[PDB]
Write an enzyme that holds these catalytic residues in place. Structure first.
Site, PDB file in Angstrom:
ATOM      1  N   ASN A  56       0.862  -1.178   0.000  1.00 55.33           N
ATOM      2  CA  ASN A  56       0.000   0.000   0.000  1.00 55.33           C
ATOM      3  C   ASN A  56       0.901   1.231   0.000  1.00 55.33           C
ATOM      4  O   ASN A  56       1.619   1.479   0.973  1.00 55.33           O
ATOM      5  CB  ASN A  56      -0.927  -0.020   1.214  1.00 55.33           C
ATOM      6  CG  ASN A  56      -1.808   1.215   1.311  1.00 55.33           C
ATOM      7  OD1 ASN A  56      -1.841   2.050   0.406  1.00 55.33           O
ATOM      8  ND2 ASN A  56      -2.537   1.329   2.417  1.00 55.33           N
ATOM      9  N   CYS A  84      -5.485   3.067  -4.483  1.00 57.49           N
ATOM     10  CA  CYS A  84      -6.829   2.541  -4.459  1.00 57.49           C
ATOM     11  C   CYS A  84      -7.002   1.195  -5.030  1.00 57.49           C
ATOM     12  O   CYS A  84      -6.407   0.268  -4.589  1.00 57.49           O
ATOM     13  CB  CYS A  84      -7.841   3.540  -4.995  1.00 57.49           C
ATOM     14  SG  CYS A  84      -7.767   5.090  -4.124  1.00 57.49           S
ATOM     15  N   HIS A 101     -11.848   1.793   1.772  1.00 59.32           N
ATOM     16  CA  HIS A 101     -10.870   0.728   1.611  1.00 59.32           C
ATOM     17  C   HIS A 101     -11.161  -0.059   0.334  1.00 59.32           C
ATOM     18  O   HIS A 101     -12.302  -0.119  -0.132  1.00 59.32           O
ATOM     19  CB  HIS A 101     -10.893  -0.199   2.831  1.00 59.32           C
ATOM     20  CG  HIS A 101      -9.668  -1.050   2.978  1.00 59.32           C
ATOM     21  ND1 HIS A 101      -8.424  -0.522   3.233  1.00 59.32           N
ATOM     22  CD2 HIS A 101      -9.505  -2.392   2.921  1.00 59.32           C
ATOM     23  CE1 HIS A 101      -7.540  -1.502   3.316  1.00 59.32           C
ATOM     24  NE2 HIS A 101      -8.170  -2.645   3.131  1.00 59.32           N
ATOM     25  N   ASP A 161      -6.481  -8.431   0.685  1.00 60.21           N
ATOM     26  CA  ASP A 161      -6.493  -7.104   1.300  1.00 60.21           C
ATOM     27  C   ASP A 161      -5.059  -6.598   1.366  1.00 60.21           C
ATOM     28  O   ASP A 161      -4.351  -6.807   2.352  1.00 60.21           O
ATOM     29  CB  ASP A 161      -7.125  -7.141   2.684  1.00 60.21           C
ATOM     30  CG  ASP A 161      -7.175  -5.772   3.342  1.00 60.21           C
ATOM     31  OD1 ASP A 161      -6.977  -4.757   2.637  1.00 60.21           O
ATOM     32  OD2 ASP A 161      -7.406  -5.711   4.567  1.00 60.21           O
TER      33      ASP A 161
END
Ligand SMILES: CN1CCC(c2noc(-c3ccc(O)cc3)n2)CC1
Length: 338
Positions: free
Chosen positions: A10, A15, A256, A273
């Protein structure tokens, strides 16, 4: 690393980018084709095909989360809100446009249209006079309207619905003058890999900020689409298998981004994730992302049942050309000297 799959880092408001990267990496027929791109002469900073090969190679071999800083630089989305101003299908369009061009003159030329291209007919039929115009168009994804629809079926029924052209919106029939007409769209073929954008993010006139619709919207694990074909094939029905569920959690602009995948197409699902990848239930990947809370799907990937084995064919280490491995191993060796 119990799943056998590695996550992504990340590194800003990237996004959905990590969701799209994993979605494309597990389009195995595309991954193998990306490796084969003649990239040895490219510049490791401007070339988008090479940066995509780097991410896919790192996703296939690294035990540690994969960085995407060189990818984000390659196509130049580097401003504060560069990903907020676009949507996932534009990013996917930027990427796939580059690799298909890179495959010109090569043994995997046409891989992007073979996987993603469908055939479609748009028409305008006059109601009082004998005149019709059909234009055949290619499509590489389908924007589905969800507001007011309960499932994918009602979204397709609304997609192929007939539009009336009367009143002020009469049709210009040229020689016949203004004419009341019907306007619609028919499906000719459906591609092996089906990218369905669910229209949850829109702008509301007269606007400032974009709004996200969190209404409940259902999609099935198996999706039969023969109904929406002008003509069907007895030996190849349009039966589709849910492969990826790109999910957003949160309010209008902020939220998220997560993607669910059963990469082998075997109904065994994983939650991607960012860097953390974990096994999840089928219910968590599909049913729990219907919405109705603030967590729901905005893009779906379906693979045609008869094409599952080829699209998801196995990718080994020997499917990466030797000149590619030598360059990336040289890159990792250079950065390791700090
Ligand atoms: C010129 N040629 C065809 C047009 C364009 C393209 N090809 O595929 C896609 C695409 C977009 C969104 C998706 O979700 C999936 C595919 N865009 C670039 C390649």
């Amino acid at each position: 690393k119990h799943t056998g799959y590695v996550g992504l880092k990340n590194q800003g408001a990237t996004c959905y980018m990590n969701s799209l990267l994993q979605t494309l990496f597990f389009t195995n027929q595309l991954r193998k084709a990306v490796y084969m791109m003649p990239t040895e002469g490219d510049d490791s900073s401007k070339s988008v095909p090479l940066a995509l090969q780097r991410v896919f190679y790192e996703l296939q071999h690294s035990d540690k989360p994969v960085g995407t800083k060189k990818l984000t630089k390659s196509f130049g989305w580097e401003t504060l809100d560069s990903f907020m101003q676009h949507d996932v299908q534009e990013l996917c369009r930027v990427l796939l446009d580059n690799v298909e061009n890179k495959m010109k003159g090569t043994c995997v030329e046409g891989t992007i249209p073979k996987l993603f291209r469908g055939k479609m007919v748009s028409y305008i039929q006059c109601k009082e006079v004998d005149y019709r115009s059909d234009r055949r168009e290619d499509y590489y994804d389908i924007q589905l309207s969800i507001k007011g629809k309960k499932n994918i079926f009602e979204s397709f029924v609304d997609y192929v619905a007939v539009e009336q052209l009367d009143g002020d919106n009469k049709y210009d029939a040229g020689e016949h003058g203004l004419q009341e007409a019907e306007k619609g769209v028919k499906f000719l073929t459906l591609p092996p890999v089906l990218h369905l954008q669910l229209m949850r993010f829109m702008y509301d006139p007269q606007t400032d900020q974009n709004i996200k619709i969190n209404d409940r919207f259902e999609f099935p694990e198996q999706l039969p689409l023969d109904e929406f074909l002008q003509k069907t094939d007895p030996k190849d029905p349009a039966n589709y298998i849910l492969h990826a569920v790109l999910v957003h959690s949160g309010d209008n602009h902020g939220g998220h981004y997560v993607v669910y995948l059963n990469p082998k197409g075997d109904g065994k699902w994983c939650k991607f994730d960012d860097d953390v990848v974990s096994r999840c239930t089928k219910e968590e990947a599909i049913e729990h992302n219907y919405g109705g809370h603030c967590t729901n799907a905005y893009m779906l990937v379906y693979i045609r049942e008869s094409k599952l084995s080829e699209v998801l064919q196995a990718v080994t280490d020997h499917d990466i050309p030797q000149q590619l491995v030598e360059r990336l191993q040289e890159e990792k060796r250079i950065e390791a000297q700090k």
